[PDB]
Amino acid sequence: VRDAYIAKPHNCVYECARNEYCNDLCTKNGAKSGYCQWVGKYGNGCWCIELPDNVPIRVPGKCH
């Protein structure tokens, strides 16, 4: 498992303003929990704790 921003195609974060939305989306994908986290290089995205290894995460690069 890993703590990271969960990703949607192609290498994009799930935009957010509310922590509960991210907790819902993260735990629905098998993570322990999650919250909304600002990142300059990406803005606000959902950050998941204990996300399963097989779930795609944001890595450096361009969202497209």
Domain that holds residue 40: 1-64
- Burial (CB count within 10 angstroms: exposed 0-12, middle 13-18, buried 19+), residue 61: exposed
DSSP per residue over the chain, as a string? -EEEEBEETTTEE-B-S-HHHHHHHHHHTT-SEEEEEEETTTEEEEEEEEE-TTS-B--SS---
User: Total domain count for the chain?
Assistant: 1
Q: What is the CATH number of the domain that holds 49?
A: 3.30.30.10
